[PDB]
Structure formats: structure tokens, C-alpha cells
Amino acid sequence: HMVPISFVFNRFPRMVRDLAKKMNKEVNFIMRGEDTELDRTFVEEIGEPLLHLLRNAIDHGIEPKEERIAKGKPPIGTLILSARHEGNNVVIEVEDDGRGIDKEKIIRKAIEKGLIDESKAATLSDQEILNFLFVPGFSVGMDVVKNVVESLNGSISIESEKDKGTKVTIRLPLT
Amino acid sequence: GSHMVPISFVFNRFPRMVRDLAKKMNKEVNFIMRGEDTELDRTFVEEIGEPLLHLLRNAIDHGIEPKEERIAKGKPPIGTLILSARHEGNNVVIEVEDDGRGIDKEKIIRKAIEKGLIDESKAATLSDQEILNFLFVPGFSTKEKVSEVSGRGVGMDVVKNVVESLNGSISIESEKDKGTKVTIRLPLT
Numbered sequence A: 001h002m003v004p005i006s007f008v009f010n011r012f013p014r015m016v017r018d019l020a021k022k023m024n025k026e027v028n029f030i031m032r033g034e035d036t037e038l039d040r041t042f043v044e045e046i047g048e049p050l051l052h053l054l055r056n057a058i059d060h061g062i063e064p065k066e067e068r069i070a071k072g073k074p075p076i077g078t079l080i081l082s083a084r085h086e087g088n089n090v091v092i093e094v095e096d097d098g099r100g101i102d103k104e105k106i107i108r109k110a111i112e113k114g115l116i117d118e119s120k121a122a123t124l125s126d127q128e129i130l131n132f133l134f135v136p137g138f139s140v141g142m143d144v145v146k147n148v149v150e151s152l153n154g155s156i157s158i159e160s161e162k163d164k165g166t167k168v169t170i171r172l173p174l175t
Numbered sequence B: 001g002s003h004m005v006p007i008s009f010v011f012n013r014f015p016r017m018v019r020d021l022a023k024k025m026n027k028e029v030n031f032i033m034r035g036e037d038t039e040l041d042r043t044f045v046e047e048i049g050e051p052l053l054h055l056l057r058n059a060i061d062h063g064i065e066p067k068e069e070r071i072a073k074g075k076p077p078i079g080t081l082i083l084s085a086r087h088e089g090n091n092v093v094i095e096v097e098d099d100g101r102g103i104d105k106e107k108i109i110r111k112a113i114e115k116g117l118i119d120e121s122k123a124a125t126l127s128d129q130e131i132l133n134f135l136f137v138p139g140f141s142t143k144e145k146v147s148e149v150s151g152r153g154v155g156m157d158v159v160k161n162v163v164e165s166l167n168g169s170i171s172i173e174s175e176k177d178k179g180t181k182v183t184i185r186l187p188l189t
């Protein structure tokens, strides 16, 4: 019993538009693969997680116009929400060309939270740093996003580089 | 003085060792060492030798395929094994890379399912890193149980634990039939 992911994606253009206006951000929102089908029981559950990722992109990712110009970047930020099938799973991606997740900030927070000390933090790989955002209570919150995705028997990944932006990938079972 | 030494202090004995293991395992290997002058804490150098040997043996044994197998695959008859060290920020990064058969990801997934760590639906959504990370989970692999029969730690256990005792980190990257790359990051200190 599947339905097009458009049942999830449809309310986003409006919400992204309002969030950007409200945060004085200029964002061009692009949705791809809205016809991609997924279990209808996933529809309600996955909406909240995706909205949070979109909000993070507009809030923490896309920089104010003045800052983007200072970086030699396109004046308007780009936010892409896509869906597609990859074998036996539905792949959903949220990608922005914003400032990227501040990895030093994450390390500092992890240390203060008592999750690691200075010594071990110094050698963490970029991916190991980003994964701290998945720890329950670290942060709503990427930790809750990961938990909900997991409750759907899915998986989540994060990719982010300074000034390039951030891409969050969610994989849900194709059942 | 400074308690620092070029990593060559340990790298130096590998060329001959690799040459030997290569023939003892009946294989032809193109062994490349890079950045042997990279300096790091002497304690790290004295401790990292065991782990590196474990990774090199893994590459020659489980990775690089016999001449006959590589030709059948469409790869050069001789495999390549690269051991390098370099400075990166305030860390020293050591890599062991081969162009062998690669980690059997489907085998890991099937084992994870058999052990009940995940079901078929979840297995289908796992990312490459999540799959490979199972190699660092204690009590996972069956061979781990094999090596432990002799009262000794298995390769991944020894490598991971020795590295962590130095406050270092370790990651594994691998693609189907395209090889394996193990990266170790150690502090400068």
C-alpha cells in the first residue's frame, strides 16, 4: 500500500518560503522526485523529521545575502529536497549550499557534554564528529530525527563541508 | 630528545616483511611506502607496529587476489599495497590501502541479520559506513571467535584497541572488488 511522496512534500514549498522570509534569508527551494512512492504508513511520521531538516538548512545553513556575497557565493541560497528509489529502499535527501555544519562547535559541545575528552576529540574524523548529532540528548534535534527514522526501520547519514553546505540522506525500506 | 622520531623507525622493516609474506601467500605485490620521514611521538611508533602489521597482512592475505583471480577480474596481475604517513593539522594520518577484493559488505549484512542486530528491512537501508563499522563491534564476526580460541585478539580488535589506547581514531573505506583503505589518525603530542 504505497502512495506518492508528494503527500509529504506538498506542504513544504509554503513552509520554506515563510521560514526564509521570517529569518531574512533568500532561498530558492527545489523539490525532485515527488512521484516517488513509499509506504503510506510512513507519510505522517516522516513529515516532522523532514521539516526539521528544512528548518535547519534555512536557519543554520543558508547565510544572509551579505555574507554569501562576501564568500563569493551565489546571492540566493539553494535548498533541494529529493526522493528516488535505489533498489530496495526509498532515498530522501535534504541538501543546502549554506555555511556547513561547524565541526569545531560540535567537538566543543561533545566535550562539555562529557561524551569525549580533548585528547580523543583531536583525532576524530569529520564523519565521526558529525555523527555526534545522532546521540540522544545531544541537541526537535537531529537526535530525534535519527530516532524517528530508525523507528521506521530506516537509516540516516550526514555530509557537510565548510562553505559547501550540508546534505542529509534518509533511506527508508521499500515495503 | 623531544620524544619524537621519524615513522621510518617502524616502517623500515616492512618492505622485506611484505616481500616475504607475499611469496608465502603466493602473490606478487607492488608495495609502496610514502612519508616515512613523518615524525611522531616515539611511544606511538613503538605501539603502532603491531597494528600496522595486522593491516598489511590483511591486505596481502584477504585483499590482494592471486594472479589468476585478478586477471579473471580484469585487473593488473600484480596488486598494489600502499602504506603512507603524513601530517594533517595537529595529527599524523597513516593509511594502508590495497586494490584487492575489498570487504565483503553483503557478508557483514547477512551476519548482522543472523546475529539479530538488524532485520532484512533495516539491512536494506544501511549506509556503507554503517555496514563497515560492524567490523569494530566486539563479538560480531565469527573469525573473531576463531582467533580468540587461541587467547589472542583478532586483527580488527587489536588494531582498533591499540589505536584508541593512543587516543587515535580509525576508519575503514572499501568498495566492491576495488580495494580497502584503513585510515589511522594519531595525535601529534
Ligand SMILES: Nc1ncnc2c1ncn2[C@@H]1O[C@H](COP(=O)(O)OP(=O)(O)CP(=O)(O)O)[C@@H](O)[C@H]1O
Pocket (backbone or CB within 6 Å): B054, B058, B059, B062, B063, B064, B098, B100, B101, B102, B103, B104, B143, B147, B153, B154, B155, B156, B157, B179, B180
Ligand atoms: N584489506 C582487506 N581486504 C579484504 N578483506 C579484508 C581486509 N582486511 C580485513 N578483511 C576481512 O575482514 C575480516 C577480518 O579481519 P581481522 O583482521 O579482524 O581478522 P582475520 O580473519 O584476518 C584473522 P586474524 O586477524 O586473527 O589473523 C577478514 O577475515 C577479511 O574477511
Ligand SMILES: Nc1ncnc2c1ncn2[C@@H]1O[C@H](COP(=O)(O)OP(=O)(O)O)[C@@H](O)[C@H]1O
Pocket (backbone or CB within 6 Å): A056, A057, A058, A060, A061, A062, A096, A098, A099, A100, A101, A102, A105, A133, A139, A140, A141, A142, A143, A165, A166
Ligand atoms: N543545515 C545545516 N547547516 C549548518 N549547520 C547545521 C545544519 N543542520 C544542523 N546544523 C548544526 O548542527 C547543530 C544541531 O542541529 P540539531 O540537532 O537539529 O539542533 P538545533 O536546531 O536544536 O540546534 C546545530 O546546532 C547547528 O549548529
Ligand SMILES: [Mg+2]
Pocket (backbone or CB within 6 Å): B054, B057, B058, B154, B155, B156
Ligand atoms: Mg587479520
